[PDB]
Structures are given as structure tokens and as C-alpha cells.
Amino acid sequence: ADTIVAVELDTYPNTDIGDPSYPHIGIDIKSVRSKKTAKWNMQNGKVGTAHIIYNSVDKRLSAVVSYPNADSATVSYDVDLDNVLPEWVRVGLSASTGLYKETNTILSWSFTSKLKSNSTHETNALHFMFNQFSKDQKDLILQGDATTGTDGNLELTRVSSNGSPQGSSVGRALFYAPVHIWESSAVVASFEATFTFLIKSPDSHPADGIAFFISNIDSSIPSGSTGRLLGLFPDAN
Amino acid sequence: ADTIVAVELDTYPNTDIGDPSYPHIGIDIKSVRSKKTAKWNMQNGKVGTAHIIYNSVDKRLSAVVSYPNADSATVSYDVDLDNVLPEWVRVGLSASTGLYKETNTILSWSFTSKLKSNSTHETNALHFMFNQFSKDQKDLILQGDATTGTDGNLELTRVSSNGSPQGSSVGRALFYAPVHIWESSAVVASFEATFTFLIKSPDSHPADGIAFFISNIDSSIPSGSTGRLLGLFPDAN
Amino acid sequence: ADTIVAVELDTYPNTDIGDPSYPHIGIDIKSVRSKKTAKWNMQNGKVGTAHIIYNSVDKRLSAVVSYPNADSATVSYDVDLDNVLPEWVRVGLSASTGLYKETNTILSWSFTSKLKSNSTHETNALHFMFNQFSKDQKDLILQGDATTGTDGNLELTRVSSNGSPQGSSVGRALFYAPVHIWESSAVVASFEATFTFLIKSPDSHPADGIAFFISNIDSSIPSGSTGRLLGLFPDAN
Amino acid sequence: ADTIVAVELDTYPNTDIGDPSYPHIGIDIKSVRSKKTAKWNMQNGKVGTAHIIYNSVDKRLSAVVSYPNADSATVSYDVDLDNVLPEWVRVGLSASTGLYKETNTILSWSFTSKLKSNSTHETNALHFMFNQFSKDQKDLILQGDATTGTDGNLELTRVSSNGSPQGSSVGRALFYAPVHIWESSAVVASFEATFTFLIKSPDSHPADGIAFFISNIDSSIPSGSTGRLLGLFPDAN
Ligand SMILES: [Ca+2]
Ligand SMILES: [Ca+2]
Ligand SMILES: [Ca+2]
Ligand SMILES: [Ca+2]
Ligand SMILES: [Mn+2]
Ligand SMILES: [Mn+2]
Ligand SMILES: [Mn+2]
Ligand SMILES: [Mn+2]
Hints:
Chains A, B, C, D: Belongs to the leguminous lectin family. Chains A, B, C, D: Homotetramer. Four copies of one chain form a homotetramer. Chain A is mostly beta strands. The first copy, chain A, is built from no helices and 16 strands. In chain A, a hairpin with a 4-residue loop joins strand 4 and strand 5. One manganese (II) ion binds at residues 8, 10, 19, 26, 34 of chain A.
């Protein structure tokens, strides 16, 4: 039902469904089986940063993930989003845990989209930036186990009182306002997203990951999408 | 019921309710009877621009209106918005006509709000800019007679096929996402709004005006607020 | 001597040096002989808009040129600017006339460059926007025949009192501050430029064109670069 | 000679020249004897943040300084900068030490100035943001003992190898490009500056302070302005 385009930070290798045998970043177009992936040297307990960029002229979705003092990981995929997504969409973050677990903490999130028309100086834009989340964040649609306010952070999946991450959890956060990514008179459409995250697990095998995604405006968590499905897909096809 | 703070571009002098005897700009705090006004040399048929600014440190709401090749008009009022408005609000534009009429056309509208916390680099922001409006503008809540899409403009009040403005009309447009204007750890909160408009009337006496306003999130047009009430107030108290 | 990367809006076809036989837009890397070009339906006397974009992840320089009510023209070229340009550069606009002529008027110009480091939230940026130019524009380095202030515009090449464009003219405008386009710890570097122009000629054959360019910081107009050389190259190799 | 407007973070009370008997923030208009001050609970060794704002409509220069987990300090002063400063100015940071000392480390610095003209959509802007400084920062004019690059920070005054601050030191950093703060057709001019700093001293009595300042473009450090004069004034009048 839902149309999903996402950049996944996959912490657990499910080789039975196409994941490489190591943590990786990937670009998912309507399927959890990434169209392209790159090895990611994930660091348990460290704050990392992900940057996602795209523009309608080049038609290439690219993402870069890094941690301080370390080399980055990058992945790119040629795709025309006009042919995949509706004209109006919502953007958000999703995460899940299953048998294995980890905290999926978001410390900041910014997004900027621009539509440049052929009229002189005619440019439409939307920009939001969160460097702190409140208990009652009215401009976010929280789904599943996601909550905001703990230490000013956004916890996508369940975490107990003692800070311990729970398994079989799924949660998403979408920006309240729909986003216009295509318009008939637009000559250039582009967006850039950045978010900082903290994945921590008491185990040697963290799971399952975090994903930045773009979807139809009325998207909701598919049934049974905990674990390897990242709260984004109904199955592994 | 609704809590309204607005900057009015009042084209018709209703001296019976406190308006000066000439077109004027004014600052309205919960009442159509402006707390402060300034003479405005309105130009029928010309595109004008209004700028509104405010910050929590100075606690002064100021507005400047101008037309190309002409001197500007300015008005300021000392007011602490924390004591007038809720923590979360919606921002919008409103206009009305009555026995007398005019077109209340909006050609562009931008808004920027910022909340700077005491945490290092911790800043929250929201910014939107419309230089063109579509027939289906999903990020705007249109109320009353307001419509978008005609020539790429936002028509706040009714205009016939031949471009002729109708009387007894009222319409408003609010940005979809609520806006956070106060937070317990914020050291500075501020906003700036800019919109360009075209007020045109076939008559020597245009009415009634356009207003930029901030209100509780669930604000709706009060009954009988056409004409002198600008689609904002239930009465003239 | 100078290192030049430029996007040319070439109004005169010099087929003897590789130009296609029609006005065109092209990407020039250290040579006036464009690495790639696209047909451009230039409109004499109309205000057009050019958009240029690039990022270090995709390594693709793309440009889009359009006029109101018309289809756009686009050109892209895969090039790693890190391998062509120095770490610090200046950005500017250049234009020329020769035997044939045209006005090379710039009405607005904006530029944004960003360097995102691997440190958390660590981002460096520079942004400038001119929608009007003054007689004494201290933040611009004017070279050759370029002047600012006439009607608030930037005239890159000589125009007489009666508004008539002169031949054999060359002029450039560079932003005063050097721009940092590469840094050892940067994970993503990108820039976007936009400018609106008005090319008008009394003749059926306008020449020679306008170009947005990036160069070493101490770049100056090469001798004899009027005409087909666009004020950028010392010869046609 | 120089014309100086500055916001001082004064760490040492020189009661003989008008300082209150405690660390304080103040607004200086052409004299080190602040026109207005406010008590500042300075924290040795902690990273603080200063915000400075001003607009031509309200004509009020305000500043807010804070540290994480602490209440802020604010100071405001009504002053028309058009009557004090030239049309073109440079903005910068200055610091000094004398008999007593402290490190005057700047970790980030951002600035935004806007000039809104009466022409439709006509707005000029300049914005820069440094979250990291390089050894060779070509867009900064360093004066005196100021250096960049150590740990990616800007050290305004001398610090030895072991990180120990030196006395009798003075240094300033100005942004390379001049800034336009007034224009004949501007209806609103405004600026906002933010910088984070780390003042650390091995002594119970740190000195002398840091100041954000605006000056004529060719401003240089006055002779003998170490110590209480903050590298800004030639004497204490
Ligand atoms: Ca997986
Ligand atoms: Ca009235
Ligand atoms: Ca040519
Ligand atoms: Ca002192
Ligand atoms: Mn995967
Ligand atoms: Mn009134
Ligand atoms: Mn050519
Ligand atoms: Mn003092």
C-alpha cells in the first residue's frame, strides 16, 4: 500500500534477505532489499551523523554517514523520484528492534526542500530544524513506540527506565506538514536532510537499524514490521 | 474564544469604532480597536509589501508597509506575547469586504521563527516561503472564501470571473504546521513575516482590509466577522 | 595562468572553435571549448534565470536556464572540482562583446556554499544575495568595463547613455571574500548559484555571452579576451 | 580615530573606570565606559554562548549571554546605529589580557545581516557561519596575537604550548568582507550575531574579557589597548 523511499542505517545483517554480511547503509526503493549498499563501520555508543541529498536535475539520491575522528561511508543510487513518489509526501525517521536490540536515539534532525519555478525569483521552500525535542512536540506525528522529551531527545524505539533498549519495538516520527516535491512549472527540485543519532546496545549484536524515509502523506507502520523490516515494509519482497 | 494578535492593513476608516479618519496600519491585541496605528498612504491597484518583526528580548511588535517609489509607514507596540498567546500557535492572513469592497490578493508570503535555547548551538527553527500558490496547496488551511491557484495567487476574499471583487466576503489562510513561540529553556524567541499584496477596487472607497495574525491553533472565522471585523473578531469591543 | 571553471550562456555561435550552430549553454573546464553543451532558445530582451549546482559526493556540475512561460535548457557534466580548482577560490560573473554586441545586464545574483565536516553539527557556510546593486558596491571586485548602480543593476559590459550596448567590451564582477570549497575533514561540499540576466541587442546577431565562473582568487581579465573568449580565456585552445 | 560599537563580556571589574564590582556584560558606544551593563555570573572553564541582535525599526541593541543549565544575563540599549556608524563596516571579535589573564577561545561564530528595500522582494543579505577554524582562514583578518587552527578554534589572545594563557596580550578577528548596514532605500536593516566562547584561567581573577564589535572597515588595534581597553579603545575616556 504505502510507497516508501528510504536510506537505511542497517545494523544487523540478515543475509537471508540480501543484506551484506556486515552493518551497512543502503538505499531502499519500495523494498527492504536495498538497490545499493555500502559497508558501514558502525560504532556502538558513539554519536554519528547522516546526510542525505537529492535534486531533480541529476536524479541521484546520495547519503553520507560519519562519526567524529573516522572515515565516512557513502552510497548513491540513480533514481528519478518523480516516477516513484507522489507530488506531496511526508518525510520522517523510523527504527526497529527484534530479537536483538539497540537504542535508536535521535539527537537532532534538519530538513530543507526547495522548488524553483521558471518565474523570475519564484522559489518555494520548507525548512525545519530540531536540536531538541519537547514532551509535547506538536509539529511531529509520532507512530508506534516513538516518544520525545527524554533528555530532550527523540527515542524511536522503547527504552526502559534504566536506559536499557527493548526488543520487538517499532516507532516512527514524521514532520507534520506535507512536503511538495514536484510541481509542473518547477525547473529544479531538491532536498537535503541531516540527522544525528546514538545507537547503543549492551549486546555484541545490535539490531535492527534506523532509516530516514519519504512516503505518501498518510503512511502508517505496516503490521509486523518490527525487526528486519525497519518499521517500513510489510514483508521482505 | 479565540486569542488574536494581528497587524491590520485597514483600508476603510470606521471612526465609530476608533479608526483614524484615513487608511492606516495598526497593531491589534485581542480587539479590533488597535492599540496603536499609523497613517498609511494606500495605493489602489499597486503591489505593496508588509514586514512584521518581533523578539522576546525587546518585546516590541513592529511592522513596516511600503510600495515601490514611495515612503514607508511604520507602527510599533510594546507587548509581551508570552502573556497574550499560548506556547503553540498558528500564523495566517485574513481579509474581508462588506458593503464596500476590494480584492485582497496575496502574491507571496514568507515566515521565519526561531527559538534559541541555552544549550550550546541548540536552536529550533521553522521557515516557509510561498512565491506562488497552487490549486491544491496542502500546507495551507483555507477558511471561508479564500482560494489559491488563480494566476498562482492567493485570493483571500471572493472575486468574480471578470476579476471584480465581491462584498460581504471573508477568508483566511493559515500555515498547516503549528508554530512554537515559547519554550521554558529559550533565551531568545523571534519571528519575522513578509507578504506582498495587491488591493484593488473599482470604487473610491475600498474596504475592509488585510491582516497578518497569530492565534490559538484551532482558530476559525467568528460568525459575522465580515466587513470592519476583518474576519478576526466576533464584535467591536 | 588562471584556472577557470565556468558555465557559459553563449549567444554567438563561433563554429570555427567548436560552438554548435545555435545559441547554447555549456560547461567550460579550463578551455572555451565546452566539454558539454545544450541548445538554448535565447530570447532577446527578456529577463532569464540561470541556476548552477554542484556537490562533492556526486561530482556533477549542472546548470538550468529558463525564461518565464518557456521550457528550460539544462546541461550537466561529470567533473571532480577538487582535481581542477584550488582549495580557496573566488566566484564571479563575466561577459563580453566583440564585432557583434548586446547588453549583459545582471539584475540579481545569489550564491551559497557549504562545507559539512565529520564533527557533530560542524558546518561552515557562506551565502550572499544581491537583488539590487549600488554605485559603490564594496563587496564586489569589478574588473574591466563592469559597473554597478545604473537602475540598481550590474552592467558587465559597456552601455552608452541611450542604453545602446558597445562592442569590444569585457567586464567581470567577483564576490570580495574568497570561498572555501574543499577542506580535509569535509564529508560533503556543495554550492548553488542563481542569477537573473537581461541580454538585449538591436541586432539580429547578439554576441558574445555571459558566464558564471569559479577561479583562483587572484584571477584577472586575460589580455585580448573580448569577443568569443568571454573575458575568461587567453586563447581558443 | 576608529568608530567602535561593541558588546563586552567584561571579566575583570575596573571600578576606577566605571565597571560595576563584578563580571558584567555591557554595551559600549565609542567608549570603554559602557552605556549600560548587567551582572554576569561568569563560569571559569565552561563554554558559554552570546547572542546579539539589532534592527533599524526599533533601534535597540540587545545581547543575551548564557551557559548550559544556568539562567541567562541580558542587556539592552536604545541607540540608532545610523547615527554612530558609517554605511559600510566590518564586524569582528576582540579580546585582551593584562596583569591578569585568561584564555579567550572562540569555538564558533555566526552572523547574518539583512537590508530590505522598498522594491518588491528586494532584499540584500550576508550570512557566514564558522563552527571550525583552519590554520589558513583566508576569509578572516587576524590582528595582533589572534591565531586560528589550534584544535579548530580561534584563540584571540596568546596561549602557550601547555595551554596556559599569557598576560599583556591583545588580538582581534574581523570578517574579510565589508558589511552594508544602511542604504537610502532600505525600509528595514537588521543583524544577528552568535558566538560560543571558552574563558579559562588558572587564577581566581581572570581578565580582561571578550567583545563582539562593529567598526569602520579599516579599523586596527589601538596602541596600548591591552588589558582593560579590550583591544578596542585608545584610552579610558
Ligand atoms: Ca538488516
Ligand atoms: Ca476599518
Ligand atoms: Ca561563442
Ligand atoms: Ca574591565
Ligand atoms: Mn539492509
Ligand atoms: Mn482599524
Ligand atoms: Mn560556446
Ligand atoms: Mn566593563
